[PDB]
């Protein structure tokens, strides 16, 4: 796992995506911290959202564990930062690098699945009153991500 | 196509596509399928942090010449 | 686009996209993606690039 | 002029080049950013390798080396 993780880190330094940033916490290559910038023209705009990444020892054959530490309002991310997302579980591919995983999660923010939600109350609001959904997500971005 | 855009593929390789400002996202995916062999159903294109939906056009997303789209794998929250 | 950046991109292109260490040496049938070495291939039932089912793997040689 | 160059990427993907010294503080970098891009320092959030950078620390303190890329994130204006 280590050699591939070092390569990803080096490959990131050369050319990180505009939307995200990541690297080791302290002296531990298996534990990273990451940022996702809220997409422009979304209720998350202007937000910087922090995440923890834990690479298992059989990475990349098994997915990294990824969770938000910044609170975020979303049908598929709970108050503990847990992300319910198929590419972190049964739809993992070993070719996904941490950069692509973070971009994938970022693309989930404006593309939730309210029909199979992690937070049912938020999903009902998203489906019935999108202006209310957007207002609350904006308020949480202000309170936690700025 | 009348302009060029870039796609960063799953492996981080950057390819160049010839497209029209009004090309649909599905047409872009069809070009990626021809160059990289990825079925469109497995392609998820991201620009400015957001996924690009089939049925919309590049101009719908203000994607300009020499924009870079990021390709990831089809995903679903749950 | 320096000579080193181009040489690195050519070497990375020949390199396994899973372990990122050994050179690619196996093509998946029928999807045709050439993306893993022989040490990574036995662990895979679906192609990491297109999720296609792997029905066979041919050892490939770039002569 | 600078001992090393670093790069600063904006949310739009534009990358700017800065001439810096390893001992430069994050506050110094924000001043250079204001010079090149016209963004006032108090509106800048700088991110490197998953961390938001604190004003009083140096580039070396954050393991920022030649050709490193930092992220410039504007506060919602
Ligand atoms: Zn391999
Ligand atoms: Zn394939």
Short mmCIF file of C-alpha atoms in Angstrom, two decimals, chain A residues 3-141:
data_model
loop_
_atom_site.label_atom_id
_atom_site.label_comp_id
_atom_site.label_asym_id
_atom_site.label_seq_id
_atom_site.Cartn_x
_atom_site.Cartn_y
_atom_site.Cartn_z
CA UNK A 3 4.48 2.59 -2.46
CA UNK A 4 1.24 3.37 -4.25
CA UNK A 5 0.26 5.87 -1.56
CA UNK A 6 3.60 7.68 -1.97
CA UNK A 7 3.11 7.78 -5.74
CA UNK A 8 -0.36 9.30 -5.34
CA UNK A 9 1.02 11.93 -2.99
CA UNK A 10 3.79 12.78 -5.45
CA UNK A 11 1.37 12.73 -8.39
CA UNK A 12 -0.89 15.15 -6.44
CA UNK A 13 1.92 17.60 -5.66
CA UNK A 14 2.71 17.91 -9.35
CA UNK A 15 -0.86 18.78 -10.34
CA UNK A 16 -3.72 18.76 -7.79
CA UNK A 17 -7.30 19.36 -8.93
CA UNK A 18 -8.74 22.80 -8.32
CA UNK A 19 -11.49 21.32 -6.16
CA UNK A 20 -9.53 19.39 -3.52
CA UNK A 21 -6.30 18.96 -1.60
CA UNK A 22 -4.91 16.12 0.49
CA UNK A 23 -1.89 14.79 2.33
CA UNK A 24 -0.57 12.86 5.34
CA UNK A 25 -1.32 13.77 8.94
CA UNK A 26 2.02 13.94 10.72
CA UNK A 27 4.40 11.05 10.13
CA UNK A 28 1.72 8.48 9.17
CA UNK A 29 1.31 7.75 5.46
CA UNK A 30 -1.84 5.71 6.13
CA UNK A 31 -3.79 8.62 7.64
CA UNK A 32 -4.43 11.70 5.51
CA UNK A 33 -6.42 14.91 5.84
CA UNK A 34 -8.19 16.40 2.84
CA UNK A 35 -10.18 19.46 1.80
CA UNK A 36 -13.06 19.67 -0.65
CA UNK A 37 -14.00 23.16 -1.80
CA UNK A 38 -17.75 23.66 -2.10
CA UNK A 39 -18.78 23.90 -5.75
CA UNK A 40 -19.40 27.40 -7.09
CA UNK A 41 -23.08 28.21 -7.72
CA UNK A 42 -24.29 25.75 -5.08
CA UNK A 43 -25.43 26.11 -1.46
CA UNK A 44 -21.94 24.91 -0.50
CA UNK A 45 -20.12 27.68 -2.38
CA UNK A 46 -17.35 29.36 -0.39
CA UNK A 47 -17.15 26.39 1.96
CA UNK A 48 -13.95 24.49 2.72
CA UNK A 49 -14.88 21.00 3.95
CA UNK A 50 -12.31 18.89 5.76
CA UNK A 51 -12.16 15.10 5.59
CA UNK A 52 -10.20 12.22 7.11
CA UNK A 53 -8.78 9.44 4.93
CA UNK A 54 -7.61 6.10 6.31
CA UNK A 55 -5.90 3.76 3.86
CA UNK A 56 -6.20 0.09 4.89
CA UNK A 57 -3.15 -2.11 4.62
CA UNK A 58 -4.61 -3.87 1.56
CA UNK A 59 -5.22 -0.63 -0.31
CA UNK A 60 -5.78 -0.32 -3.25
CA UNK A 61 -7.61 -3.64 -3.43
CA UNK A 62 -9.87 -2.40 -0.65
CA UNK A 63 -11.23 1.17 -0.57
CA UNK A 64 -9.96 3.93 1.69
CA UNK A 65 -12.15 4.94 4.61
CA UNK A 66 -13.26 8.55 3.99
CA UNK A 67 -15.41 10.71 6.28
CA UNK A 68 -16.15 14.40 6.68
CA UNK A 69 -14.91 16.16 9.77
CA UNK A 70 -16.62 19.42 8.81
CA UNK A 71 -20.35 19.14 9.41
CA UNK A 72 -22.29 19.29 6.13
CA UNK A 73 -26.00 19.24 5.26
CA UNK A 74 -26.73 16.44 2.80
CA UNK A 75 -29.08 13.43 2.34
CA UNK A 76 -26.21 10.93 2.02
CA UNK A 77 -23.79 12.29 4.68
CA UNK A 78 -24.78 12.13 8.32
CA UNK A 79 -23.96 14.39 11.32
CA UNK A 80 -20.97 12.17 12.14
CA UNK A 81 -19.50 12.77 8.69
CA UNK A 82 -20.20 9.24 7.45
CA UNK A 83 -20.62 9.13 3.65
CA UNK A 84 -22.91 6.44 2.22
CA UNK A 85 -21.58 6.10 -1.31
CA UNK A 86 -21.23 2.98 -3.42
CA UNK A 87 -17.66 3.65 -4.59
CA UNK A 88 -16.52 3.57 -0.95
CA UNK A 89 -18.04 0.10 -0.63
CA UNK A 90 -19.20 -2.46 -3.17
CA UNK A 91 -18.50 -0.33 -6.28
CA UNK A 92 -14.90 0.49 -5.36
CA UNK A 93 -12.39 0.23 -8.18
CA UNK A 94 -8.67 -0.24 -7.40
CA UNK A 95 -7.80 2.25 -10.15
CA UNK A 96 -9.53 5.12 -8.29
CA UNK A 97 -6.87 7.34 -6.74
CA UNK A 98 -7.52 9.56 -3.75
CA UNK A 99 -7.83 12.60 -6.05
CA UNK A 100 -10.60 10.93 -8.06
CA UNK A 101 -12.32 9.78 -4.86
CA UNK A 102 -12.37 13.34 -3.53
CA UNK A 103 -13.68 14.70 -6.84
CA UNK A 104 -16.30 11.94 -6.80
CA UNK A 105 -17.43 12.95 -3.31
CA UNK A 106 -17.47 16.59 -4.35
CA UNK A 107 -19.76 15.69 -7.28
CA UNK A 108 -22.07 13.95 -4.82
CA UNK A 109 -22.78 17.23 -3.03
CA UNK A 110 -25.08 18.59 -5.77
CA UNK A 111 -26.11 15.09 -6.88
CA UNK A 112 -27.63 13.41 -3.84
CA UNK A 113 -29.71 10.26 -3.81
CA UNK A 114 -32.76 11.32 -1.76
CA UNK A 115 -34.59 8.07 -2.60
CA UNK A 116 -32.12 5.87 -0.68
CA UNK A 117 -30.94 8.38 1.91
CA UNK A 118 -28.68 8.26 4.92
CA UNK A 119 -30.56 11.13 6.58
CA UNK A 120 -34.26 10.71 5.77
CA UNK A 121 -35.39 14.08 7.14
CA UNK A 122 -32.94 15.94 4.90
CA UNK A 123 -34.00 13.88 1.88
CA UNK A 124 -37.69 14.74 2.41
CA UNK A 125 -36.83 18.45 2.50
CA UNK A 126 -34.70 18.12 -0.64
CA UNK A 127 -37.59 16.46 -2.47
CA UNK A 128 -40.35 18.85 -1.36
CA UNK A 129 -38.84 22.32 -0.74
CA UNK A 130 -35.56 22.83 -2.55
CA UNK A 131 -35.35 26.48 -1.51
CA UNK A 132 -35.58 25.36 2.12
CA UNK A 133 -32.93 22.69 1.47
CA UNK A 134 -30.64 25.26 -0.14
CA UNK A 135 -31.16 27.77 2.68
CA UNK A 136 -30.23 25.25 5.37
CA UNK A 137 -27.23 23.92 3.45
CA UNK A 138 -26.07 27.53 3.02
CA UNK A 139 -26.52 28.18 6.75
CA UNK A 140 -24.50 25.11 7.69
CA UNK A 141 -21.77 26.11 5.20
#
